[PDB]
Structure formats: structure tokens, C-alpha cells
């Protein structure tokens, strides 16, 4: 499994500030063993791909489940590809819990993005009430299941565990808590899909990661990389890229 | 003195090559000074479209969120839309409301923020078939317009688009006279609840089925001030609709 560092810019930046960030990213030495992906705001997918060096891949932050249609405000994997992006983030916690995207919709997006030739960063994770009621496994397994049932080929998927229970709650995850969930996820893939899928699928950590914390997280045997939030908008992202070095 | 307004909502259609062809057609087209023309591309192509379209055509975003930056993966802000050279945003479109579950409250907040950020707003309202058949057209469109109104300090940068959602994909058709009835009622609501100044100056555009053949009759209705066009906005037929008053 190649180490995978994704940067989720979320709804941040303008051409000036993003252009600057991109200059900083273009100066990064990307390790030969590490795959790097940046997810700009949708209005800047095209802009970012044009300005970023090809050593960094571009992802969309979301997409819909058909190629063209009467879906005001949506983009398709076809448009994503057309702008030179090769990845899409699907099932992000904000899509699920702010915007109410169901597991079934997320699964249908995943199959369509994969069929169009995109890589997919598929996100799962439990909230605090779910964790504290003891149902972390039930939640993340069902989210992973609904994805799994809506797809066939696992080679272009990266799984991203998001400890949603650590977002603005006053709790945070230790590296050991992250490892524990990643290990259970890998175990789910083994028992529900195949050994081969379990062994080759990157499971990346989508919780808080900084330049200070990235190496300890990366050393966890079942943590294969990151989907970075806030630090992805800073030079600090370049150091996170180096987490396995 | 209400300037005729024609919006083209490209929805989730096209790629750089095919939209480039469309833009070529629009650039070559005669736009009467009469008319304010606005095109809304897929969000991935707002920048692309603004760079290639002649300045006689304004660019809209198809949706936005309600804060300037934030942890809202998949969203764009009015600041981003303006940064890409677009001067309008479409809000409350029937697909946002009914396919993607956007509440009146959220739409009102978006309108407020977009207006505060300097964008124009194409604010969409309309009733479904079940609401129409229950006799509650007025109640529905008045409540939607009210929520939008509660989130307004200035009306000069707003265009209201009535979408007869009951008549889009249902088998049912709407007549020019049915469109006019809703439009005059909305304007009456503006007069009673906002001001006569707003009622007299606010473009109320029709967002139902419009083609080259029907646009002229619709445009002649006294309270129909233009169009928010769907499918036909992707075709040269759009130029016929731009010229519906000519």
C-alpha cells in the first residue's frame, strides 16, 4: 500500500491565496513512496489543476451520480475529469451531517465515479453520541457495507476514517484510538470482501493531523495516510507529506 | 422601465468543448440593449465560462452557501463566485429544494449572505403538483417569498423566478394566463408586504417550460418580466428567447 496524503481545502481560499498555496506545494519534494492529492473548492478545480505541478493530483470535493442532467448546483465525474482532476472525495462528514447525504446516495456516487475512471476517497465515521452509545463498529461497518454493495472494483478506492466524534465536541482521538478503528475496518474488509482487498486498500486517517502529530499517526500499522483539513491550506501540509520519511 | 431579464440555467450539462461551442453561439448573438442576459454554468466551469463569454452576458453560479469560508466540503461562497467574475447566484432552485432538501430557512440565509457580499440573486419559488391541486399555490409561494423577504435589507439586486414545479416533468402544462396569474399575485404580495416601489421595480421571471415558439406570448404577459430557461439554454434557440420582446 502506497502512503497517501490528501488535502481537503474545504470551502476556503480565493485565486490569490490559493495561487500562493500552490506555489508552496509546487516547491515540495514529494517522496517516491507517497501519493499526494489536493481537493480545491469546486469553483477552482480547473484553476488548481492548471497551476499545480503534476506530482500533485487534484480531487473534487464532491460529485453527483449521473453524467449530465437537471441537477442545478451539481457536478459530474465527467466534468471533474474534463478539468484534469483524477479523484473525488465522497461521503465526507460535512456532506453526511450538514447536508444530509444518505449512505445509499453515497454508494451510488461511488459506483458512478469509479465507472467514469476517477479514484474515490470514500469517507466514513461515527459521531460522539454513536461512539458513547457503544456503536462505533455498527456505524462505520454499515457505512462501509453500503459503499461495498454499490461497487465491484476496490483498486481505485481509498477509505478515509473520520472521527466525527472529535469535531467540536471537546474530545479528541489518540493515535491508538485511530489505529484501533483502522484495524477494525481492515478486519471488516477481510471478512466481508476479501483478504486481498483488506491487504491492498489504503485506509487513511481523516481526523486532526498537524506537522507535530503526523509521524506518530503514520507509524500506526493500519494508518496508510491522511485526509488533512486545516493544515492542508498551509506550508505545514508539505511536512505532513513527509510523514513516513 | 423593468429591464427584461433572460437567465439560462445550464444545470449539470456540458464539458469545456461543448460549452465552448455554446459560448461561441452566444458571443455571436445579437443581444438587444433592451435585455439583461445571464448564464449559469455548472460550478466547475464558472471561471471558464466567464473568461470566454463576451461581457454583454453576465455569469451566475447555480447555488452557493451562507458564509464566506468554512468547513463545508463541496460548497462555494459568494466571495468565490465574485472572485471568478460572476455577478449573480441562483438560489432556491426547485432542484435544490425538492431533490436536495434545501429548506426555506437555509435559502433565506443564503440570500442574505449573497446580497451582503455584492452578488445579484435569482431567487426561485414555486409550488408542487400536490400543493397546486390542494388549492394552496398562494400560501406556498407567499410563504417562500416571505422567508426571502425576511432576509433582505435591499431588493434592487434581486430577481424573483416563479417555477411552476407542478408543471415540470408531471405531464401537466401551464398556460400563459396561469403564469400571469401567479406573477400578478406575487407582485401584489410585494406591494402589500414590502412597498409599491419594490412591487413596481422587481423583475418577476417565469421559470416554467419556455421555447422559441412560446417565449413571445409569455413575455407579453404584463407581470412576466423574462425567463429562467432550462433545457433550451443549452441550444441556439436561447437567442430566440433573448429576443422574445423584439
XYZ file of C-alpha atoms in Angstrom:
491
model
C 0.000 0.000 0.000
C 1.435 3.338 -1.128
C 1.271 6.090 1.532
C -1.483 8.594 0.680
C -1.730 12.230 1.733
C -4.848 14.107 0.712
C -5.505 17.790 1.404
C -9.113 18.886 1.739
C -9.236 22.670 1.264
C -12.979 22.690 2.073
C -14.741 25.977 1.255
C -11.652 28.146 1.634
C -9.497 30.421 -0.455
C -9.562 32.638 -3.485
C -7.368 32.638 -6.617
C -4.792 34.880 -4.963
C -4.495 32.924 -1.688
C -4.835 29.537 -3.439
C -2.324 30.550 -6.128
C 0.141 31.257 -3.287
C -0.524 27.935 -1.551
C 0.009 26.185 -4.879
C 3.451 27.825 -5.250
C 4.382 26.406 -1.845
C 3.067 22.971 -2.846
C 4.910 23.047 -6.178
C 8.157 23.506 -4.203
C 7.520 20.350 -2.151
C 9.709 17.291 -2.696
C 7.105 14.540 -2.950
C 8.610 11.271 -1.635
C 8.700 8.436 -4.200
C 6.735 6.272 -1.746
C 3.931 8.835 -1.178
C 0.865 9.744 -3.280
C -0.337 13.371 -2.890
C -3.847 14.735 -3.703
C -5.406 18.204 -3.179
C -9.177 18.876 -3.175
C -9.899 22.524 -4.013
C -13.277 24.229 -3.802
C -15.314 23.240 -6.820
C -15.070 26.677 -8.457
C -11.252 26.260 -8.516
C -10.776 22.648 -9.637
C -9.751 23.844 -13.115
C -7.636 26.761 -11.809
C -5.794 24.473 -9.357
C -5.075 21.700 -11.861
C -3.651 24.266 -14.301
C -1.334 25.745 -11.683
C -0.277 22.633 -9.729
C 2.699 20.554 -10.812
C 1.576 17.026 -11.976
C 3.389 15.492 -8.946
C 0.197 16.508 -7.068
C -3.154 15.088 -8.228
C -6.397 17.109 -7.992
C -9.651 15.902 -6.444
C -13.177 17.218 -6.460
C -14.736 17.664 -3.001
C -17.999 16.001 -4.120
C -19.933 14.985 -7.245
C -23.274 13.571 -8.400
C -24.252 10.139 -9.778
C -25.056 10.722 -13.452
C -23.007 12.142 -16.287
C -25.325 15.079 -17.246
C -28.840 16.120 -16.116
C -31.323 18.504 -14.489
C -29.390 18.884 -11.250
C -28.819 22.551 -10.610
C -25.737 23.020 -8.463
C -24.173 19.570 -9.094
C -21.065 18.437 -10.966
C -20.442 15.055 -12.570
C -17.317 12.868 -12.673
C -17.239 13.690 -16.420
C -16.799 17.397 -15.604
C -14.179 16.517 -12.993
C -12.126 14.529 -15.489
C -12.623 17.236 -18.076
C -10.958 19.710 -15.693
C -7.941 17.308 -15.283
C -8.856 16.058 -11.789
C -8.403 12.318 -11.194
C -10.036 11.904 -7.733
C -13.242 12.768 -5.888
C -14.000 12.832 -2.175
C -17.310 11.152 -1.367
C -19.241 10.722 1.865
C -17.369 13.458 3.702
C -18.769 14.079 7.200
C -19.938 17.564 6.152
C -21.882 16.074 3.226
C -23.426 13.471 5.553
C -24.131 15.561 8.646
C -24.532 19.101 7.387
C -26.122 18.358 4.023
C -27.885 15.050 4.816
C -26.358 12.820 2.104
C -27.569 9.262 2.704
C -25.461 6.103 2.584
C -27.431 4.948 -0.461
C -26.731 8.150 -2.390
C -23.035 7.998 -1.404
C -22.825 4.382 -2.642
C -24.423 5.298 -5.990
C -21.937 8.236 -6.346
C -19.040 5.925 -5.636
C -20.059 3.393 -8.349
C -20.597 6.171 -10.879
C -17.319 7.977 -10.104
C -15.370 4.690 -10.299
C -17.092 3.739 -13.575
C -16.182 7.120 -15.074
C -12.492 6.387 -14.216
C -12.000 8.549 -11.113
C -10.259 7.455 -7.967
C -12.507 7.820 -4.894
C -11.653 8.828 -1.344
C -14.643 7.330 0.428
C -15.255 8.742 3.899
C -16.884 7.087 6.891
C -17.060 7.732 10.640
C -19.156 7.923 13.807
C -20.414 10.856 15.863
C -19.998 11.282 19.595
C -23.456 10.031 20.561
C -22.814 6.916 18.451
C -19.362 6.330 19.935
C -20.584 6.836 23.518
C -23.555 4.513 22.977
C -21.024 1.801 22.042
C -21.917 1.605 18.306
C -18.722 2.796 16.575
C -18.400 -0.535 14.750
C -22.038 -0.763 13.802
C -21.923 2.746 12.282
C -18.637 2.510 10.367
C -19.305 -1.049 9.217
C -22.762 -0.121 7.842
C -21.368 2.930 6.031
C -18.594 0.771 4.575
C -21.136 -2.007 3.704
C -23.486 0.323 1.756
C -20.452 1.558 -0.186
C -19.261 -2.044 -0.757
C -22.677 -3.163 -2.053
C -22.773 -0.306 -4.534
C -19.359 -1.230 -6.020
C -17.330 -4.106 -7.521
C -13.743 -2.913 -8.108
C -11.711 -1.779 -4.988
C -8.413 -0.899 -6.748
C -9.187 2.844 -7.123
C -10.738 3.360 -3.661
C -9.105 4.852 -0.578
C -11.074 4.595 2.687
C -10.938 7.648 4.998
C -11.903 7.214 8.672
C -13.221 10.475 10.155
C -13.635 10.545 13.920
C -16.652 12.865 13.663
C -16.958 12.491 17.478
C -13.809 14.684 17.777
C -15.207 17.650 15.755
C -16.019 20.479 18.073
C -17.096 18.161 20.846
C -14.303 18.612 23.369
C -12.969 15.088 22.713
C -10.021 14.118 20.570
C -8.654 10.857 19.251
C -5.325 9.391 20.279
C -3.146 7.646 17.691
C -4.072 4.415 19.464
C -7.816 5.149 19.029
C -7.218 5.839 15.305
C -5.231 2.543 14.938
C -7.994 0.656 16.750
C -10.653 1.818 14.236
C -8.398 1.350 11.186
C -7.643 -2.195 12.338
C -11.338 -2.996 12.759
C -12.028 -1.547 9.284
C -9.310 -3.673 7.738
C -10.817 -6.675 9.558
C -14.246 -5.825 8.065
C -12.765 -5.815 4.557
C -11.165 -9.190 5.151
C -14.386 -10.842 6.472
C -16.901 -9.090 4.153
C -14.978 -8.639 0.879
C -11.625 -10.390 0.667
C -8.194 -10.785 2.166
C -6.670 -9.238 -0.944
C -8.916 -6.130 -0.685
C -8.058 -5.794 3.049
C -4.317 -6.075 2.341
C -4.189 -3.609 -0.596
C -6.812 -0.922 0.330
C -5.393 2.313 1.806
C -7.240 3.304 5.000
C -6.327 6.948 5.685
C -6.950 8.977 8.809
C -9.290 11.954 8.379
C -9.110 13.334 11.941
C -6.898 16.098 13.281
C -3.389 15.936 11.815
C -0.606 18.501 12.135
C 3.098 18.570 11.378
C 3.556 17.761 15.080
C 1.327 14.656 15.099
C 1.708 13.200 11.580
C 4.711 10.862 12.128
C 3.229 9.110 15.197
C -0.105 8.639 13.333
C 1.677 7.418 10.182
C 3.626 4.810 12.208
C 0.374 3.080 13.244
C 0.375 -0.206 11.244
C -3.155 0.247 9.789
C -2.958 4.036 9.174
C -1.890 4.434 5.491
C -2.012 8.228 5.244
C -4.253 11.246 5.817
C -7.134 13.263 4.579
C -5.952 16.628 6.019
C -8.287 19.568 6.886
C -6.980 22.945 8.090
C -3.278 22.220 7.783
C -3.783 21.479 4.029
C -4.097 25.236 3.445
C -0.624 25.896 4.963
C 3.063 25.116 4.327
C 2.613 22.619 7.184
C 0.946 20.309 4.619
C 4.416 19.851 2.989
C 5.702 18.469 6.272
C 2.671 16.134 6.596
C 3.516 14.838 3.100
C 6.827 13.735 4.695
C 5.083 11.825 7.494
C 6.513 8.394 6.515
C 10.025 9.728 5.903
C -38.606 50.539 -17.178
C -38.298 46.997 -15.663
C -35.480 45.662 -17.806
C -36.400 42.351 -19.484
C -34.256 39.556 -17.967
C -33.316 36.228 -19.559
C -31.434 33.675 -17.457
C -30.021 30.471 -18.920
C -29.602 27.677 -16.373
C -27.257 25.143 -17.952
C -27.816 22.865 -14.903
C -25.450 19.861 -14.762
C -24.676 19.742 -18.513
C -21.707 20.158 -20.817
C -17.921 19.973 -20.888
C -15.317 22.537 -21.940
C -15.587 21.665 -25.640
C -19.424 21.575 -25.884
C -19.868 24.628 -23.619
C -17.210 26.408 -25.682
C -19.447 25.880 -28.744
C -22.462 27.239 -26.853
C -20.434 30.271 -25.725
C -19.406 30.908 -29.363
C -23.063 30.956 -30.368
C -23.954 33.360 -27.552
C -20.992 35.681 -28.290
C -22.045 35.839 -31.973
C -25.644 36.543 -30.988
C -27.300 39.942 -31.115
C -28.292 40.901 -27.591
C -30.676 43.807 -27.553
C -29.734 46.583 -25.032
C -33.339 46.080 -24.050
C -32.340 42.895 -22.253
C -30.242 41.668 -19.327
C -28.801 38.226 -20.205
C -27.409 35.866 -17.556
C -25.890 32.392 -17.985
C -25.439 29.911 -15.093
C -22.821 27.211 -15.835
C -22.003 24.108 -13.841
C -19.899 25.232 -10.880
C -16.726 23.617 -12.270
C -16.992 25.950 -15.275
C -17.959 29.330 -13.791
C -14.383 30.606 -14.324
C -14.033 29.026 -17.785
C -17.375 30.455 -18.918
C -16.664 33.963 -17.599
C -13.272 34.035 -19.328
C -14.809 33.061 -22.718
C -18.177 34.849 -22.667
C -18.431 38.387 -24.002
C -19.158 40.955 -21.177
C -22.696 41.535 -22.614
C -23.533 38.211 -20.891
C -23.334 38.026 -17.112
C -22.415 34.786 -15.363
C -24.261 33.250 -12.454
C -23.431 30.467 -10.031
C -26.142 27.799 -9.772
C -26.008 27.748 -5.923
C -23.854 28.933 -3.007
C -23.509 28.597 0.748
C -24.207 31.142 3.537
C -20.760 32.058 4.908
C -17.661 33.415 3.229
C -15.304 30.496 4.019
C -15.695 27.423 6.223
C -15.684 23.718 6.848
C -18.276 22.945 4.162
C -16.772 20.396 1.809
C -18.424 20.634 -1.573
C -19.751 24.209 -1.198
C -18.756 27.518 -2.729
C -19.241 31.032 -1.274
C -20.357 34.318 -2.825
C -16.755 35.557 -2.397
C -15.554 32.738 -4.631
C -18.287 33.449 -7.201
C -17.302 37.139 -7.377
C -13.611 36.127 -7.470
C -14.397 34.134 -10.624
C -16.018 37.213 -12.280
C -19.614 36.095 -11.821
C -22.112 38.684 -10.594
C -25.224 36.526 -9.942
C -26.253 33.465 -7.992
C -29.332 31.274 -8.421
C -30.877 30.405 -5.037
C -33.822 28.249 -4.017
C -33.991 26.487 -7.379
C -36.647 23.776 -7.332
C -33.941 21.072 -7.672
C -32.137 22.366 -4.544
C -35.462 22.443 -2.666
C -37.005 19.188 -3.823
C -34.155 16.874 -4.894
C -31.564 18.060 -2.330
C -33.888 19.123 0.555
C -32.799 22.771 0.967
C -35.154 24.448 3.495
C -36.738 27.883 3.171
C -34.685 28.951 6.202
C -31.381 27.928 4.593
C -32.339 29.619 1.341
C -33.206 32.851 3.227
C -29.803 32.791 4.946
C -28.051 32.248 1.585
C -29.942 35.142 0.014
C -28.937 37.457 2.861
C -25.265 36.464 2.635
C -25.089 36.606 -1.201
C -26.704 40.045 -1.188
C -24.398 41.243 1.629
C -21.412 40.086 -0.491
C -22.427 42.155 -3.557
C -23.960 39.450 -5.804
C -27.269 39.690 -7.545
C -29.703 36.917 -6.706
C -32.095 34.958 -8.860
C -34.373 33.735 -6.050
C -36.586 30.865 -7.052
C -40.022 29.976 -5.685
C -42.874 27.645 -6.718
C -45.417 25.009 -5.751
C -45.539 21.289 -6.470
C -48.458 19.445 -8.141
C -49.894 18.218 -4.807
C -49.771 21.829 -3.441
C -51.408 23.176 -6.631
C -54.139 20.503 -6.525
C -54.706 21.172 -2.758
C -55.523 24.795 -3.699
C -52.515 26.190 -1.798
C -50.489 27.831 -4.628
C -50.723 31.299 -2.965
C -49.895 30.029 0.518
C -46.826 28.196 -0.764
C -45.371 30.956 -2.992
C -46.240 33.717 -0.471
C -44.524 31.815 2.334
C -41.428 31.207 0.193
C -41.306 34.882 -0.879
C -41.845 35.976 2.758
C -38.855 33.985 4.059
C -36.725 35.547 1.294
C -38.188 38.941 2.224
C -37.295 38.456 5.945
C -33.613 38.139 4.901
C -33.463 41.312 2.796
C -32.304 44.895 3.523
C -32.185 45.869 -0.227
C -34.303 44.492 -3.125
C -32.579 46.164 -6.123
C -30.252 43.186 -6.761
C -32.950 40.511 -6.629
C -34.933 38.866 -9.394
C -37.778 36.541 -8.388
C -38.273 33.429 -10.554
C -41.582 31.623 -10.347
C -41.129 27.930 -11.167
C -44.396 26.071 -11.833
C -42.916 22.886 -10.365
C -46.377 21.259 -10.692
C -45.902 21.665 -14.477
C -42.270 20.477 -14.821
C -41.937 16.713 -15.502
C -45.532 15.963 -14.420
C -47.435 15.707 -17.728
C -49.235 18.956 -16.784
C -48.750 22.133 -18.801
C -49.126 25.735 -17.652
C -50.809 28.360 -19.883
C -49.554 31.932 -20.379
C -52.604 33.035 -18.403
C -51.748 30.715 -15.468
C -48.211 32.086 -15.368
C -49.554 35.667 -15.437
C -51.957 34.913 -12.523
C -49.149 33.796 -10.201
C -46.878 36.632 -11.306
C -49.516 39.339 -10.612
C -50.271 37.766 -7.231
C -46.599 37.812 -6.282
C -46.307 41.455 -7.326
C -49.462 42.182 -5.251
C -47.794 40.473 -2.308
C -44.714 42.693 -2.772
C -46.953 45.806 -2.867
C -48.854 44.793 0.328
C -45.866 43.481 2.326
C -42.757 45.358 1.175
C -43.553 48.504 -0.820
C -45.064 49.678 -4.061
C -41.535 50.735 -5.106
C -40.344 47.097 -4.809
C -43.515 45.742 -6.476
C -43.032 48.090 -9.446
C -39.263 47.568 -9.934
C -38.700 43.878 -9.152
C -38.366 41.613 -12.130
C -40.540 38.517 -11.703
C -39.365 35.979 -14.294
C -41.020 32.769 -15.421
C -39.155 29.517 -14.789
C -41.551 27.029 -16.396
C -41.273 25.483 -19.855
C -40.213 28.121 -22.391
C -39.197 27.625 -26.041
C -38.617 29.736 -29.144
C -42.247 29.182 -30.145
C -43.825 30.108 -26.740
C -41.466 32.827 -25.417
C -43.193 35.798 -27.149
C -46.672 35.130 -25.797
C -45.275 34.553 -22.285
C -43.171 37.714 -22.495
C -46.261 39.778 -23.474
C -47.930 38.947 -20.131
C -47.825 42.196 -18.144
C -46.317 40.698 -14.944
C -43.896 38.270 -16.645
C -40.576 40.151 -16.939
C -38.409 37.451 -18.517
C -37.315 33.867 -18.101
C -35.147 31.443 -16.269
C -34.646 28.890 -19.015
C -33.728 25.221 -18.538
C -33.032 22.828 -21.436
C -33.327 25.437 -24.204
C -30.479 27.488 -22.643
C -28.056 24.849 -23.997
C -29.273 25.405 -27.607
C -29.199 28.301 -30.152
C -32.964 28.575 -29.502
C -31.839 30.555 -26.384
C -31.118 33.510 -28.703
C -34.798 33.462 -29.779
C -35.767 33.677 -26.090
C -33.310 36.610 -25.506
C -35.245 38.363 -28.332
C -38.722 37.468 -27.044
C -39.719 41.182 -26.776
C -38.230 42.045 -30.194
